[PDB]
Design an enzyme around this catalytic site. Structure first.
Site, PDB file in Angstrom:
ATOM      1  N   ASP A   1      48.089  40.732  32.962  1.00  0.00           N
ATOM      2  CA  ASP A   1      49.216  40.463  32.070  1.00  0.00           C
ATOM      3  C   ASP A   1      49.074  41.245  30.761  1.00  0.00           C
ATOM      4  OD1 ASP A   1      51.185  39.057  33.338  1.00  0.00           O
ATOM      5  OD2 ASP A   1      50.415  37.069  32.816  1.00  0.00           O
ATOM      6  N   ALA A   2      49.138  42.563  30.902  1.00  0.00           N
ATOM      7  CA  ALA A   2      49.146  43.467  29.765  1.00  0.00           C
ATOM      8  C   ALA A   2      50.239  44.508  29.955  1.00  0.00           C
ATOM      9  CB  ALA A   2      47.794  44.137  29.576  1.00  0.00           C
TER      10      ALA A   2
END
Lengths: 1114, 64, 46
Positions: free
Chosen positions: A734-735
């Site tokens: 989740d970047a």
């Protein structure tokens, strides 16, 4: 027109007079209005015991409104600005006229302030009701602020709403061991706890509020004499099991003795613990069995309010029969059921405090009267001595501010109620409001009342949970769920005397008779006999449904037990519902052309049996249906709409269908704090963390409940083009590879403000008064980075990048340099230890506003708009509307990002690894109705349980030239040829949260262990950085390497080799100890100062002081 | 608060195109066709006008 | 000597010096907004 539109346009119908927040304002409106007069009915009337009867008498106490109307802002009318800048508080005096029963006969009726009411902002007395968004200019404020929060010394203090269980009601639980009939009653006064128990193998006793021991019940029934114990047993029941089970208690009582009331009740006459108040019974030497029976009028301590004890008798005899649950092993009555939990609310707490502060002031007035007898003057009661006026002010403000409703009459010193509105947007400005807070839940970590019970479908939100500690314990009362304050019980007493509800003083213990359904609980108050529940209840409904009694008076008909309640008391949740009329909903498909345009003015759908108000109980009776489309012909009510269990802060996701529950909990937490446009005030005001954006964009896959909030005129996040694409190992967990050249073109600014308050005090003897002004004006920086950038007068600097510990404001600070007594004469202000106000972080702010806000005392504030436009960087926080909270992994430049064929390159990039294991399929669709709503000009809805399906959106994408699936055909910037697998695109609505990597710059240079408090740099107040607490050093010591641990020890805080020993030696010198320089007792031992502080603090508290050494060598 | 002069992901200039819609929403095209008579033939600028909130007017209502 | 005291409720300037609390001319209005200054602040236009 259709069958449907009617039930989805009842919302702006009821969301105006009693909607989403307006329960707060309704309650407090009533509590300004009439309940204060109610408490006035507790007149003084006792004050002149040793006097010729100079009683006072409040003629009429109103909140600045006996004969007056414009006394509702009595600081020369003042808006909430002039209360959020000058830090002043709202104030309306609770004025009153008094009726001296004076022996000099001057009955003086002057309007006397008794304190001040902190008026809820935007009540029916504030200056912000009945006004247009044009009138909201001279009052500096938005039209669409939530409204309902107080003004506490310039701080917005809302009142969290508690969940305190119902009074007046039996609680027949079933422990794994035995039954418990615990009727925790009240009288608005105290938590009286007259519990019964299945104590010892069929032995019944009363843990009353006081009584010294356990009292066998049959003796209790003697105390309200029914002495013919035949009557006891026949009343408790008539079957085999009930009689047999109760038998042991009568047998034990008789074996003790059977006497009437004048004997065998001295057995409780002396066994009473409220005898512990021997000194509290000064007069009335008459104290024993007959006399705790004389004071057994209060041995009511229950809802039932009679003097002939037959009411309390039958109450105990239904208690005793609803504790023996006919072998009470199969019968279970659960606590957490929202017919039981009744919401005590901001106004209700203020009503408790009305009561208690007026009674406290009246008590101190009584004390002054009872000491003023020697005074032969007129001012025994006079207004001049009646001079605690405007000190109920302090009580109210202390309560609302500290969060302490400190009490004596109500047995609760509650702390933790009031909080500060989290104005990060207007989304959390509501979410903070309309919040319900849990209560005791005896062991709050015993997660019984933590999972969401099915017992408030509607009335409390399903997904609003702050994961962590306050999950299932802070609650968003998130929608249509109207709320009740109180009623009059009278016009149900009349309908009981009429409708076929007997007088219980006409029958005896017939009350085990299945035709005789005989719960009639008029708010706990006693009971009503007559049979025919299935007519009384139904005609009572169909009588209130036709313009008569006020549609809130829910009545349950349970058949497991003989339950027919009449709950007409406060704390009740509610909801509106469409009446089915048992065959077809009574809106007739054509009320729309009255529901919308002209008439049926409104709420006149309540005076026509067309739509009506339930409770939890009445929902436990009725048979609702979700849609009309699937009514099956036995339904009593109809759902107005499915999308109002998902509420004001929680109905922000698009298509909350498809997400999990965890994901919508995440989002309905994140969305609160996310940087947003506080609205219309912003610039006129001053306040700490005004985390604005600069170019915000409306949502673009919106929900019919985004409009109703009005907070789609004030959107909280940029609307971002987005791909679904895996760039190169930084995206991963989740970047987000957010490209630059959109941070450059303004995607997602910030305008982080902050607030410095130079509270320029004043002092009694010496003065800050005149002493303002630095500007020494030396050569370098006129004079120096101390006082480089202030101004002519050292105060202001509206626009200069004041940097890194310059001066924002200074003041020579002579506070008490003159001793208040006859001390030093010379300190007439040459003794300034100047106290600069300087601090900042490692970036330039820009002083944007300067405020000399000065309340009536010259206590100069300096409010200041220290704005710091921290545009994003690798590390910043995003959310998604789907609890998908990535962070900027890379920041790529424009030319490297993929471009479809038209020319579009992403702003954001996700990778398709947040979805398949979170399963937010409410995001693969939001990107369909974005790119289909803009490519066509539309502005789409995916609303909870409705929305816009995938097929029409697919056809829209077709019409303007794309896939059904909206998956573009991209080539790759880096190398310059088509991606092999296609690439999702289209608009998302990325919110930009708080909690960045610039507010989180922290580091520590050194940590020693001090001497002042003898501490290392723990947590804050010394630096930022680390704090090796419990689990941290627990990990530190758990390594497995010897002098790795030794090094950690030697570098922990300090290792001073100070000299100390036991043989004539202590904490002193090494070479020549002035303590004891024996020259043979030199130690020089490594030791942190904490152990030395332990030595000192345990010198006072004596303990064995072992001290010795040993050889490191062989 | 004000109109992004550039479509954050396109490049096209935008701020020149807000006092035409407030004159082309009263010739009363459908928004989807007031934003075809001015050039916006991509996602981007359609967002950058359809989605924006001119807080300029309401804020300046009480600026001083 | 300067006049840096605007009032968001009395658009007029006093700078009545210390020992005179705030009062904007003829009113309380103790809500002074203080004027900006004349230094040529420089902005990276990025």
């Amino acid at each position: 027109i259709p069958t449907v539109e009617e039930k989805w346009r009842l919302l702006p119908a009821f969301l105006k007079v009693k909607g989403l927040v307006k329960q707060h304002i309704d309650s407090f409106n009533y509590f300004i209005n009439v309940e204060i007069k109610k408490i006035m009915k507790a007149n003084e009337k006792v004050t002149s015991d040793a006097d010729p009867m100079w009683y006072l008498k409040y003629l009429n106490i109103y909140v600045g409104l006996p004969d007056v109307e414009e006394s509702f802002n009595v600081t020369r009318p003042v808006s909430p600005h002039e209360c959020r800048l000058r830090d002043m508080t709202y104030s309306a005096p609770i004025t009153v006229d008094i009726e001296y029963t004076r022996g000099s006969q001057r009955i003086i009726r002057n309007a006397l302030p008794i304190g001040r009411m902190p008026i809820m902002l935007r009540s029916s007395n504030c200056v912000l009701t009945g006004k247009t968004p044009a009138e909201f200019a001279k009052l500096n404020e938005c039209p669409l602020d939530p409204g309902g929060y107080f003004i506490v010394k310039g701080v917005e203090k809302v009142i969290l709403i508690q969940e305190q269980l119902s009074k007046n009601r039996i609680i027949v639980e079933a422990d794994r061991k035995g039954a418990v009939g615990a009727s925790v009653t009240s009288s608005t006064h105290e938590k009286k706890s007259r519990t019964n128990m299945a104590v010892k193998q069929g032995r019944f006793y009363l843990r009353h509020n006081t009584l010294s021991e356990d009292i066998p019940i049959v003796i209790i029934f003697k105390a309200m004499g029914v002495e013919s114990d035949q009557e006891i047993v026949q009343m408790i029941g008539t079957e085999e099991h009930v009689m047999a089970a109760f038998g042991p208690s009568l047998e034990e009582c008789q074996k003790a003795q059977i006497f009437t009331q004048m004997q065998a009740l001295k057995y409780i006459g002396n066994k009473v613990r409220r005898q512990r108040m021997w000194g509290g019974g000064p007069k009335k030497t008459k104290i024993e069995e007959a006399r705790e029976l004389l004071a057994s009028t209060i041995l009511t301590h229950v809802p039932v309010k009679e003097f002939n004890f037959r009411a309390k008798c039958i109450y105990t005899a239904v208690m005793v029969r609803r504790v023996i649950l006919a072998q009470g092993d199969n019968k279970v009555d659960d606590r957490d059921y929202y017919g039981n939990k009744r919401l005590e609310l901001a106004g209700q707490l203020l009503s408790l405090l009305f009561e208690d502060l007026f009674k406290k002031f009246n008590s101190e007035m009584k004390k002054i009267a009872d000491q003023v007898i020697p005074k032969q003057r007129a001012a025994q009661f006079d207004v001049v001595k009646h001079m605690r006026q405007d000190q109920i002010t302090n009580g109210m403000v202390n309560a609302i501010s500290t969060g302490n409703w400190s009490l004596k009459r109500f047995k609760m010193d509650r702390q933790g109620v009031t909080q500060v509105l989290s104005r990060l947007s207007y989304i959390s400005a509501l979410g903070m409001m309309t919040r319900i807070s849990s209560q005791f839940e005896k062991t709050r970590k015993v997660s019984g009342p933590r999972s969401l019970q099915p017992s408030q479908w509607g009335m409390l939100c399903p997904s609003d949970t702050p994961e962590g500690e306050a999950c299932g314990l802070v609650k968003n009362l998130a929608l249509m769920t109207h709320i009740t304050t109180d009623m009059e019980d009278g016009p149900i007493v009349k309908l009981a005397s009429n409708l076929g509800v007997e007088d219980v003083n006409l029958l005896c213990g017939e009350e085990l008779s299945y035709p005789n359904v005989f719960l009639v609980f008029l708010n706990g108050n006693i009971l009503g006999v007559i049979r025919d529940h299935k007519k009384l209840v139904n005609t009572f409904r169909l009588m209130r449904r036709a313009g008569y009694i006020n549609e809130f008076v829910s009545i349950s008909t349970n058949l497991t037990d003989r339950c027919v309640y009449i709950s007409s008391d406060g704390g009740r949740l509610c909801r509106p519902y469409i009446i089915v009329k048992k065959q077809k909903p009574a809106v007739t498909n054509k009320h729309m052309e009255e529901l919308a345009q002209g008439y049926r003015n409104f709420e006149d759908f309540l005076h026509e049996s067309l739509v009506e108000y339930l409770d939890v109980n009445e929902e436990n009776d009725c048979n609702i249906a979700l849609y009309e489309h699937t009514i099956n012909k036995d339904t009593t009510h109809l759902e107005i709409e499915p999308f109002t269990l998902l509420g004001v802060c929680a109905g922000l996701i698009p298509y909350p269908h498809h997400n999990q529950s965890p994901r919508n909990t995440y989002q309905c937490a994140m969305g609160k704090q996310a940087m947003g446009t506080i609205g219309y005030n912003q610039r006129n005001r001053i306040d700490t963390l005004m985390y604005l954006l600069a170019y915000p964009q409306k949502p673009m896959v919106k929900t019919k409940t985004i409009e109703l909030i009005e907070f789609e005129k004030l959107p909280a996040g940029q609307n971002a083009t987005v791909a679904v694409m895996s760039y190169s190992g930084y995206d991963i967990e989740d970047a987000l590879v957010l490209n630059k050249a959109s941070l450059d073109r303004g995607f997602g600014r910030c305008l982080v403000y902050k607030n410095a308050k130079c509270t320029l005090k004043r002092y009694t003897n010496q003065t800050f008064d005149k002493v303002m002004g630095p500007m020494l004006d030396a050569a370098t920086r006129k004079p120096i980075w101390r006082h480089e950038i202030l101004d002519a007068d050292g105060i202001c600097s509206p626009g200069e990048k004041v940097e890194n510990k310059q001066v924002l404001v200074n003041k020579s600070m002579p506070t008490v340099t003159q001793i208040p007594l006859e001390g030093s004469n010379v300190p007439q202000q040459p003794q300034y230890k100047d106290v600069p106000i300087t601090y900042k972080g490692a970036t330039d702010s820009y002083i944007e506003k300067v405020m000399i806000s000065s309340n009536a005392e010259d206590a100069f504030l300096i409010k200041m708009l220290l704005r710091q436009t921290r545009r994003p960087e690798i590390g910043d926080k995003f959310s998604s509307r789907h609890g998908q909270k990535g962070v900027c992994g890379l920041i790529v430049p424009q030319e490297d990002m993929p471009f479809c064929d038209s020319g579009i390159c992403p702003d954001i990039i996700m990778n398709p690894h947040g979805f398949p294991s979170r399963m937010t399929v409410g995001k693969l669709i939001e990107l369909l109705a974005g790119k289909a709503g803009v490519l066509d000009g539309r502005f789409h809805y995916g609303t909870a349980f409705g929305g816009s399906k995938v097929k029409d959106v697919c056809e829209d994408l077709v019409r303007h030239g794309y896939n059904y699936l909206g998956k573009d055909y991209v080539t790759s910037g880096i190398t310059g040829e088509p991606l092999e697998a296609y690439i999702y695109f289209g608009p998302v609505y990325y919110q930009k949260l708080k909690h960045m990597v610039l507010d989180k710059m922290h580091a520590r240079a050194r940590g020693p262990r001090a001497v002042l408090t003898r501490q290392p740099t723990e947590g804050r107040s010394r630096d930022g950085g680390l704090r090796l607490g419990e689990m941290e050093r627990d990990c530190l010591i758990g390594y497995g390497a010897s002098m790795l641990l030794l090094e950690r020890l030697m570098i922990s805080s300090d290792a001073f080799e100070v000299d100390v020993c036991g043989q004539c030696g202590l904490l002193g010198y090494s070479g020549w100890c002035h303590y004891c320089k024996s020259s043979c007792h030199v130690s020089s031992l490594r030791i942190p100062y904490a152990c030395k502080l332990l030595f000192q603090e345990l010198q006072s508290m004596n303990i064995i002081p072992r001290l010795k050494l040993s050889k490191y060598n062989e | 608060m004000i109109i992004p002069v550039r479509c954050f992901t396109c490049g096209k200039i935008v701020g020149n195109k807000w006092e035409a819609y407030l004159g082309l929403l009263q010739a009363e095209y459908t928004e989807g066709d007031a934003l075809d008579a001015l050039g916006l033939k991509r996602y981007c600028c359609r967002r950058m006008l359809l989605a924006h909130v001119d807080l300029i007017e309401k804020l300046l209502n009480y600026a001083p | 000597q300067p006049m840096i005291y605007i009032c968001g409720e009395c658009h007029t300037e006093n700078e009545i010096k210390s020992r005179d609390p705030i009062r904007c001319r003829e009113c309380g209005y103790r809500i002074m907004y203080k004027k900006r200054t004349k230094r040529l602040v420089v902005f990276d236009a990025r």
